[PDB]
């Protein structure tokens, strides 16, 4: 789906498969957290469906030794003094010592600051200990989380449910057409991005020779030149787009192992899964009620959330005994305008926007040799058009797709291409559309606050700020205190402080609330990107103090108060709202549940010969299924005729469906539902087993 999804896919610890315990066989104890996973397998991250606990993810620092056990690095404290040498321990070796956590106060020598340290002893035991019994200590306060979990600012502020949906959801974000990195993020994203392999790095050090859209040419100091390609609009496995963009300017000095191109989702060599948006937290006239989301039209006009989705369809020319099929331009009984897009080859030319139902590849099977029908001999005789030895099986555009034809590709027997056994040419075609966001697409923040967009207001209706900036997204209040995850509010406050920049009062001295604040943080320039790691970020007092020093606006005024609440004007009414609303920035991502994929309707269609029910599938606009609890609903209503209609003419009886379709097109009453054709078959089968079934009328005589 993006870089983070792939990197996470490769670090996976799966419990299922060939040679392991079954899914139904694994007890409920195998599936929960165990006090020895600490620092090896992430307790937070897991799938949410029926494979919960059965797929974990390898922790950040953990690494696997030869035999096959997972080890985590510690540092060793010989006698209350912390070393710089680190030992990788397994789960059974660690059970034999006493391990203290990375928050223990340390001197500059490595001397323990207090008398008693908190430590983990044996299995699932926590206790204070005098400073002599301390053997080891953790590498980093975020040693116990995964790579996807590691990128959730203020993760120790959420609960495990919303943290889980947050980690889980980040690996389903669609890469946009533009990327920006988040104004508030973890130290994790430069590292994650460079590792997951979709940025192009520089192998040696040198000077940029020439920059293209297609390639970068580097000049080594050695004298030899290395040229890197950048694949442009590749259809990645999950239908999203992959694009590489040379990030460096021409004639520059590049270090060895430096980023040079920006893959999908990466900005400046950084894991960027969304955009920064100006959010205000309140209910707004029930358009965001029940976890939906109000979007500002500015996003759709500026292309802030546009994506590129690239499809592919494939059809081929395989031999049948009646003859060898072929892909060719002319097609019986299709006007010239419809066939204008295809060329002489039979394939659509590159860049012709295709509405559904259109032809992409024109192929004809040699029609099975039957006799030419006499009624058809007169019908075709009056005009003089022969139904040739060929029927028409041309590749067509499924409904609900559009876009351009960016590239076609063909395999032949003459080219010497490897082909499957019995097919002569295979043809694929790529169609790429550009989706703008709208109703019914899923959005999500980073703390597992999903949502569908239920409305898009026009720019001049959004509650706007005292200086006339309209907010972009309006996230309701009622889902913050119920989920029990307030990391999003802190992410918003900090985010606003990153937007405006700030300058602490350092002339009089340093105020107390910023004593432990780093020196580079005393004073930020507008739109400065901060980082707050996991389990070691901005504290409360430090945040609150940062909200008093926000730089005043280009008009002169200061827009949010000491609380983080601002005064908003109502776009429709034009009055000010009667209280201050909480505005600020947030990092929002566009998930992969789009309304164009997940919409199917079907009045009639193609059925299946044997089950005689409508043929399933989202790709053949199959009909949607009507299970058993919907029947119990029907019967609790007393709706006899609706349920008898669903169960008979809408699925099984062929006679019924033909009669109903015909009566509807003709404009007469639909026939009143009688006895299914299925009944007579039940009786023919009971009559097969030498049972004898008769039907009794009121009087008692058979029928």
């Amino acid at each position: 789906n993006n870089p983070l999804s792939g990197l996470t896919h490769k670090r996976r610890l799966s419990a299922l498969g060939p040679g392991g315990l079954s899914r139904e066989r694994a007890g409920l104890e195998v599936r929960d957290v165990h006090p020895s996973h600490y620092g090896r397998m992430c307790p937070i991250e897991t799938p949410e469906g029926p494979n919960i606990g059965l797929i974990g993810s390898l922790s950040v620092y953990a690494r696997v030794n030869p035999f096959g056990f997972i080890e985590t690095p510690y540092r060793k404290v010989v006698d209350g003094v912390v070393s710089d040498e680190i030992v990788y321990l397994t789960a059974d070796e660690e059970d034999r010592h006493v391990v203290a956590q990375a928050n223990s106060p340390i001197d500059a020598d490595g001397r323990f600051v207090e008398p008693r340290v908190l430590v983990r002893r044996k299995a699932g035991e926590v206790e204070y200990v005098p400073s002599s019994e301390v053997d080891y200590m953790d590498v980093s306060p975020r040693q116990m989380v995964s790579v996807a979990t590691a990128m959730i600012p203020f993760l120790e502020h959420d609960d495990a449910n919303r943290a889980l949906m947050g980690a889980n959801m980040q690996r389903q974000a669609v890469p946009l057409v533009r990327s920006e990195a988040p104004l508030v993020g973890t130290g994790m994203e430069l590292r994650a991005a460079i590792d997951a392999g979709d940025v192009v790095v520089a192998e040696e050090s040198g000077v940029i020779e020439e920059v293209s859209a297609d390639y970068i040419t580097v000049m080594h100091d050695n004298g030899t030149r290395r040229t890197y390609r950048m694949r442009k609009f590749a259809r990645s496995n999950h239908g999203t787009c992959a694009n590489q963009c040379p990030i460096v300017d021409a004639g520059d000095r590049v270090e060895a192992g430096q980023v040079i191109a920006d893959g999908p989702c990466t900005d400046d060599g950084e894991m960027a899964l969304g955009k920064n948006l100006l959010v205000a937290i309140m209910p707004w006239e029930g358009h965001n009620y029940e976890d939906a989301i109000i979007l500002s039209n500015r996003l759709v006009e500026e292309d802030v959330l546009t994506s590129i989705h690239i499809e592919e369809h494939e059809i081929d020319a395989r031999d049948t005994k009646l003859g060898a099929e072929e892909i060719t331009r002319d097609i019986p009984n299709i006007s010239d305008e419809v066939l204008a897009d295809l060329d002489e080859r039979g394939i659509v030319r590159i860049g012709a926007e295709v509405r559904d139902g259109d032809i992409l590849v024109g192929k004809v099977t040699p029609k099975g040799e039957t006799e030419l029908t006499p009624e058809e001999r007169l019908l075709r005789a009056i005009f003089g058009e022969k139904a040739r030895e060929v029927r028409d099986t041309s590749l067509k555009v499924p409904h609900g797709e559009s876009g351009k034809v960016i590239g076609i590709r063909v395999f032949s027997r003459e080219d010497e291409d490897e082909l499957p056994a019995g097919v002569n040419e295979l043809v694929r075609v790529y169609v790429a559309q550009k989706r703008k966001i709208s109703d019914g697409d899923k959005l999500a923040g980073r703390h597992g606050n999903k949502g569908v967009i239920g409305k898009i207001l026009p720019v001049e209706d959004m509650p706007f700020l005292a200086d006339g900036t309209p907010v972009d997204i309006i996230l309701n209040t009622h889902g913050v205190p119920r989920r029990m995850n307030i990391g999003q509010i802190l992410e918003t406050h900090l985010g606003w402080c990153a937007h405006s920049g700030w300058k602490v009062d350092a002339a009089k001295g340093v105020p107390d609330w910023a004593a432990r604040l780093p020196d580079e943080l005393l004073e930020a320039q507008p739109n400065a990107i901060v980082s707050t790691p996991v389990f070691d970020g901005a504290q409360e007092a430090e945040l609150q103090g940062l909200l008093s020093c926000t730089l005043p606006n280009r008009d002169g005024d200061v827009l949010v108060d000491a609380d983080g609440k601002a005064m908003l004007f109502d776009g429709r009414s034009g009055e000010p709202f009667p209280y201050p609303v909480t505005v600020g920035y947030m990092y929002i991502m566009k998930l992969h549940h789009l309304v164009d994929d997940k919409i199917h309707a079907r009045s009639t269609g193609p059925y299946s010969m044997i089950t005689q029910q409508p043929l399933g599938g989202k790709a053949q606009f199959g009909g949607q299924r009507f299970g058993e609890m919907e029947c119990w609903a029907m019967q609790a209503y007393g709706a006899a005729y609706t349920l008898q209609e669903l169960l008979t003419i809408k699925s099984d009886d062929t006679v019924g469906r033909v009669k109903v379709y015909e009566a509807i097109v003709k404009g007469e009453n639909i026939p009143e539902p009688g006895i299914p054709e299925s009944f007579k078959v039940l009786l023919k089968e009971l009559q097969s087993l030498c049972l004898n079934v008769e039907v009794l009328s009121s009087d008692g005589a058979a029928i």
Partner: peptide
């Protein structure tokens, strides 16, 4: 520059503890 990576754009950090080993 505390960051190992050659030309990485820098984020001020609310880091209270120095990390002994790099990831």
């Amino acid at each position: 520059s505390n960051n190992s990576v050659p030309g990485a754009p820098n984020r001020v950090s609310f880091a209270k503890l120095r990390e002994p080993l790099e990831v």
